[PDB]
């Protein structure tokens, strides 16, 4: 029973940190996308 409880808590912390990793990856990709948009805008301003 103690092994079973430990296994369940490991699955739980596993999934929680996995969701955290997905959120971090999505936020960094959002930063990359926004900053690329700003680079496009600045190049357009350069040509203007």
């Amino acid at each position: 029973e103690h092994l079973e409880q430990e296994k369940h808590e490991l699955r739980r912390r596993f999934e929680n940190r996995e969701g955290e990793w997905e959120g971090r990856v999505s936020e960094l990709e959002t930063d990359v996308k926004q900053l690329q948009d700003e680079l496009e805008r600045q190049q357009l301003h350069l040509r203007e």
């Binding site: 029973e1 079973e4 409880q5 296994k7 369940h8 808590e9 699955r11």
Partner: protein, 80 residues
């Protein structure tokens, strides 16, 4: 009395769950276990209510049925 055996089984599984906790993953087999046992307890209880009312009607008929052996014996055949 007839459902006495079946009802205790639910109390046993209830007694089992009273020790379990959400931290164990034994909750989910237990959830499966309790539903099956409670499901059986509902069905068999429903069966007896149908049967027991029939027996209640049949024994009631003995009060008002005709006083001949065949009329009685036919009623005692249904209850048997």
């Amino acid at each position: 009395l007839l459902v006495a055996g079946l009802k205790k089984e639910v109390q046993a599984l209830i007694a089992e769950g009273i020790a379990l906790v959400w931290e164990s993953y034994k909750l989910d087999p237990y959830v499966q276990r309790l539903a099956e046992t409670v499901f059986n307890f509902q069905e068999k209880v429903d069966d007896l209510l149908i049967i027991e009312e029939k027996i209640d009607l049949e024994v009631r008929s003995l009060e008002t049925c005709m006083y001949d052996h065949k009329t009685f014996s036919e009623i005692l055949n249904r209850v048997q």
